[PDB]
Amino acid sequence: XXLXXX
Amino acid sequence: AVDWIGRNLYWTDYALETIEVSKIDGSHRTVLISKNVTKPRGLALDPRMGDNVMFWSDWGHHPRIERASMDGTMRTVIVQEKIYWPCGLSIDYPNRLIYFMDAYLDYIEFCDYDGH
Numbered sequence A: 001x002x003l004x005x006x
Numbered sequence B: 001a002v003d004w005i006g007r008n009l010y011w012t013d014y015a016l017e018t019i020e021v022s023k024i025d026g027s028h029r030t031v032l033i034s035k036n037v038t039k040p041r042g043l044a045l046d047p048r049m050g051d052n053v054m055f056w057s058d059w060g061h062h063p064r065i066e067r068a069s070m071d072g073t074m075r076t077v078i079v080q081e082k083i084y085w086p087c088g089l090s091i092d093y094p095n096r097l098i099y100f101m102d103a104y105l106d107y108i109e110f111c112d113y114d115g116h
């Protein structure tokens, strides 16, 4: 999972 | 993070790359810290009189956890050595310890207000 919340 | 003593509301913005403060009802709004802020996620406060410090975590190109006064004056860096993806902060008020996590090195750590 990418860390960027969006 | 809300300030239950000063009646203020703090939040960190990833898109604006700022740390902002406002009243509990949101009447007045200003940008507190924007100088060296790149990707702020974590945020915690210690409003008890005598400490009056705030903490936040940044996962930019030089990730760090920084401490400053809740008015943003005495800005300093406490943890900069073994972090890659600082994600989430919290404060243990009775013992005056700050708990922080990392999503890349996958750990949970706690430390005092001065980073030692």
Ligand SMILES: *[C@@H]1O[C@H](CO)[C@@H](O[C@@H]2O[C@H](CO)[C@@H](O)[C@H](O)[C@H]2NC(C)=O)[C@H](O)[C@H]1NC(C)=O
Residues within 6 Å of the ligand: B035, B036, B075
């Ligand atoms: C923002 O970051 C820059 C770069 O790290 C800081 O500039 C450094 O400041 C320290 C003293 O605090 C010096 O020892 C370095 O030589 C400086 N580096 C350069 C290339 O200028 C700057 O102080 C920071 N500013 C704020 C407001 O946090």
